[PDB]
């Protein structure tokens, strides 16, 4: 919930080495490591509201 | 019980689809046994002519 804390909001492309605990229709409980290839998007990188 | 009913329903449907694959397989299994016997008899014609 709250582990890391930094002064900067990383906008560059990155990933999250997250693992989920999902269950399929056959009830098969399996955990699975995810990446979430993400990146922040700003069309106008000067507007105070959007920024 | 209300979750075992779901398991039974999905496994029954999958068993039916497995029977689908099995029965369609046996179906053209018959036809291809048939068509290869067709060619075999086509040339058993020459067999028995010359024999």
Curated annotation (Swiss-Prot), chain A:
It is found in: Cytoplasm; Nucleus. It comes from the Eukaryota. Phosphorylated on Tyr residues after EGF stimulation. Dephosphorylated by PTPN11. The vault ribonucleoprotein particle is a huge (400 A x 670 A) cage structure of 12.9 MDa. It consists of a dimer of half-vaults, with each half-vault comprising 39 identical major vault protein (MVP) chains, PARP4 and one or more vault RNAs (vRNAs). Interacts with TEP1. Interacts with PTEN and activated MAPK1. The phosphorylated protein interacts with the SH2 domains of PTPN11 and SRC. Interacts with APEX1. May interact with ZNF540. Required for normal vault structure. Vaults are multi-subunit structures that may act as scaffolds for proteins involved in signal transduction. Vaults may also play a role in nucleo-cytoplasmic transport. Down-regulates IFNG-mediated STAT1 signaling and subsequent activation of JAK. Down-regulates SRC activity and signaling through MAP kinases. MVP 3 mediates interaction with PTEN. This is Major vault protein. The lineage of its organism: Eukaryota, Metazoa, Chordata, Craniata, Vertebrata. The gene is Mvp. The chain holds residues 508 to 558 of 861 of the full protein.
Swiss-Prot record, chain B:
It is found in: Cytoplasm; Nucleus. It comes from the Eukaryota. Phosphorylated on Tyr residues after EGF stimulation. There is a cross-link at residue 45 (Glycyl lysine isopeptide (Lys-Gly) (interchain with G-Cter in SUMO2)). The vault ribonucleoprotein particle is a huge (400 A x 670 A) cage structure of 12.9 MDa. It consists of a dimer of half-vaults, with each half-vault comprising 39 identical major vault protein (MVP) chains, PARP4 and one or more vault RNAs (vRNAs). Interacts with TEP1. Interacts with PTEN and activated MAPK1. The phosphorylated protein interacts with the SH2 domains of PTPN11 and SRC. Interacts with APEX1. May interact with ZNF540. MVP 3 mediates interaction with PTEN. Required for normal vault structure. Vaults are multi-subunit structures that may act as scaffolds for proteins involved in signal transduction. Vaults may also play a role in nucleo-cytoplasmic transport. Down-regulates IFNG-mediated STAT1 signaling and subsequent activation of JAK. Down-regulates SRC activity and signaling through MAP kinases. This is Major vault protein. The chain holds residues 660 to 710 of 861 of the full protein.
């Amino acid at each position: 919930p709250h582990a890391r804390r930094a002064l900067c909001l990383l906008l560059g492309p990155d990933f999250f080495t997250d693992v989920i605990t999902i269950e399929t229709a056959d009830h098969a409980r399996l955990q699975l490591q995810l990446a979430y290839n993400w990146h922040f998007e700003l069309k106008n990188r000067n507007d105070p509201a959007e920024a | 019980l209300a979750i075992e009913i779901t398991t039974n329903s999905q496994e029954a449907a999958a068993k039916h689809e497995a029977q689908r694959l099995e029965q369609e397989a046996r179906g053209r299994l018959e036809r291809q046994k048939i068509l290869d016997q067709s060619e075999a008899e086509k040339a058993r014609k020459e067999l028995l002519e010359l024999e």
